Every structure is written in C-alpha cells, then in structure tokens.
Design an enzyme around this catalytic site. Structure first.
Site, mmCIF file in Angstrom:
data_model
loop_
_atom_site.group_PDB
_atom_site.id
_atom_site.type_symbol
_atom_site.label_atom_id
_atom_site.label_comp_id
_atom_site.label_asym_id
_atom_site.label_seq_id
_atom_site.Cartn_x
_atom_site.Cartn_y
_atom_site.Cartn_z
ATOM 1 N N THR A 13 -9.722 -15.081 -43.759
ATOM 2 C CA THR A 13 -9.890 -14.261 -44.951
ATOM 3 C C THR A 13 -11.366 -14.238 -45.324
ATOM 4 O O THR A 13 -12.135 -15.125 -44.939
ATOM 5 C CB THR A 13 -9.050 -14.789 -46.129
ATOM 6 O OG1 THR A 13 -9.465 -16.124 -46.460
ATOM 7 C CG2 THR A 13 -7.571 -14.791 -45.768
ATOM 8 N N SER A 48 -15.915 -10.749 -38.310
ATOM 9 C CA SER A 48 -16.257 -10.303 -36.962
ATOM 10 C C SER A 48 -17.763 -10.145 -36.734
ATOM 11 O O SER A 48 -18.189 -10.326 -35.581
ATOM 12 C CB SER A 48 -15.483 -9.024 -36.587
ATOM 13 O OG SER A 48 -15.980 -7.851 -37.201
#
Length: 314
Positions: A13, A48
């Site tokens: 998260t 990412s």
C-alpha cells in the site's frame, strides 16, 4: 479440478494525497473465483518506481522454484514500471506456464466497491492453458498484451495499457478468452545476477555534445539514446559519440516515435547510416526503457563483440 495459481503481490500500500491506499481483502483469499485456488504472497512492498532489476531477478527465481507446484502465476505490480518487469521476465528462461502481470489498484475506496476486476481477469488468463505458449502477458481492462510490446499510455484513475500498432494479443470476452495470434518465440537467458550502469538520454533539436561530455566514461557500461525518427541525431552529438564507441562502450538507439521503427537510411552526419557504420546499435521495435534492459541483460549474460551487436539489432 481447480486450477492452482501462485499470486505474487509486489506493491503493498502507498501514501497518496494524505491517506494510505486500501488493500482489498479479495487480493488475499484462497478461492476468489469458482474453479480457481490462489496461494497469495506479500512478496514485495514496493511502489513500482522503487522496483529494481534485483527485484525482477528474485521474482524470476521464485517462479522457477515453484514452477512444478502451480498451474500459473499472477504478479500484481504498480503500473508505473510494470512493463519493465514484464519485459525482463519475458527475456528470462521462465517455465512453460501462464505468467501474467496486472496492475496494483491504488484506491482510497475503503469498502472495496471499486472491485479487483483486473486481478480477477488476470487469474482467468493464468488459468487458461492457451496462455502457456504466449510468453509473459500483461492483462488490463479486458485486453491481453505481449510483454515485449506493451506500454502504459494513460494516467487515468486506473491506468491504460496498449500495444502500439498491433493491438492486443487477446481479448477477455464474457465466456471465452480470445487470442488473435501466437507471437514468435523470444531469445531468452537464465540470468542470475545484474550489475552495471546503462542510462537513457533523449535527443532534441539543439542537442550538441554538452550532456555527453559530462558522462564519466570510466563508470558507464552502456547508453540508450532516444533518437529522432528512424534513428538520427545532431551532427555534434554523433561526433562526440565516437569517444564512447572507441572506448568500447555500447550505444543503442531507439526511435522516440510511439509507432516508430528504427531504420538506418540517411547518410549525413548524425544520420542513421553513419551512426550504424560508427558502431551504434539500432534497436528495431522497442521503447527506450525496454531497450535499456535488453542491453543490460545482454552484457550481464556474456554477449560481446559481433554477438552483442547481432542480438541487440535482431
């Protein structure tokens, strides 16, 4: 019998403008769909933009280790660099089984009423044995894309991915998964380590030698240039590249154009014919971030000389 899918969540998260994104519990249950049984791992907890080739190698190793225990693999991954990890895995000697990447949904909806549609779609594709011979796949918004050609195109609330020019390898229909073709098998390597510095710079009208002159050539293992059109750069830039090429540093170019194909045709200074004669590699149909990985993988795998040129330009 149910299909058994290994699910590797990499995105955790994240903090968003400030709240923490919600983790839908459906991402973790063992039976999210009829006929599909999942073993889900919190494999990484990385935005990412923080994913590195060392993480991509660990994903590869996990897939090799578990290949005989599952029917297929689903990786969830932040969408910003998903295409880079997908391309990397598709260049590794992955086992013959469905391997699908899909986006980590970044949601502030606490009840999860926006769903996990793309994850469920990825499980469907990973459970279809027709996917085993299609290479590593990216599944988003009912489309199935080849890792070698897919890219993120839109920055909407849920990202959009596209395959430039050729469209998707397949489509998710209501009661079938439709594939349009089988792509050509890829050259792959069983890599166990990645090191080296290979950055990306972009050509522009007015570029000369000032940026390239700043590069510390003793630490540079390669360079990707996003060139004009079919593969041209300014005259001063091409003259300066000789100091890299003659030191043995590989330089590879891609077209900066979205549907571009690199083709050496022009013979003025900086023209693609002159660049290729000088030793620049022309990467035919690949974007810059994937060409960067292609060069990095090739150097770490052991390609040198003619074989390195032939692979990069193949």
């Amino acid at each position: 019998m149910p299909k058994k899918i290994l699910v590797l969540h990499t995105g955790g998260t994240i903090s968003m403008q400030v709240v923490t994104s919600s983790d839908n519990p459906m991402n973790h249950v063992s039976n999210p769909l009829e006929g599909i049984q999942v073993h889900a791992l919190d494999f990484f907890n990385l935005p990412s933009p923080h994913i590195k080739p060392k993480h991509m190698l660990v994903l590869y190793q996990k897939i090799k280790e578990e290949a005989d225990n599952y029917d297929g693999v689903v990786i969830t991954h932040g969408t910003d660099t998903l295409e880079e990890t997908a391309y990397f895995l598709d260049t590794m000697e992955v086992p013959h089984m469905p391997i699908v990447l899909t986006g980590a949904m970044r949601s502030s909806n606490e009840l999860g009423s926006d769903g996990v549609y793309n994850y469920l779609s990825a499980l469907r594709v990973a459970s279809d044995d027709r996917a085993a011979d299609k290479g590593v796949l990216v599944v988003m918004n009912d489309e199935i894309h080849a890792a070698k050609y897919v890219t993120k195109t839109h920055t909407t609330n849920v990202s959009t991915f596209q395959t430039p020019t050729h469209g998707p390898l397949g489509l998710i229909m209501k009661q079938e998964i439709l594939y349009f073709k089988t792509a050509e098998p890829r050259v792959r390597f069983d890599l166990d380590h990645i090191q080296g510095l290979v950055p990306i710079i972009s050509a522009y009208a007015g570029m000369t030698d000032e940026l390239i002159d700043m590069l510390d050539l003793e630490h540079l293992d390669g360079l990707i240039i996003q060139a004009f059109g079919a593969g041209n750069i300014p005259k001063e830039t091409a003259q300066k590249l000789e100091s890299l090429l003659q030191k043995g540093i590989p330089v590879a170019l891609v077209s900066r154009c979205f549907n571009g194909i690199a083709e050496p045709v022009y013979a003025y200074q900086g023209g693609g014919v002159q660049l290729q004669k000088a030793g620049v590699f022309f990467v035919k149909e690949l974007n810059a971030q994937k060409a960067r990985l292609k060069l990095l993988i090739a150097l770490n795998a052991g390609l040198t000389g003619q074989a390195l040129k032939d692979y990069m330009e193949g």
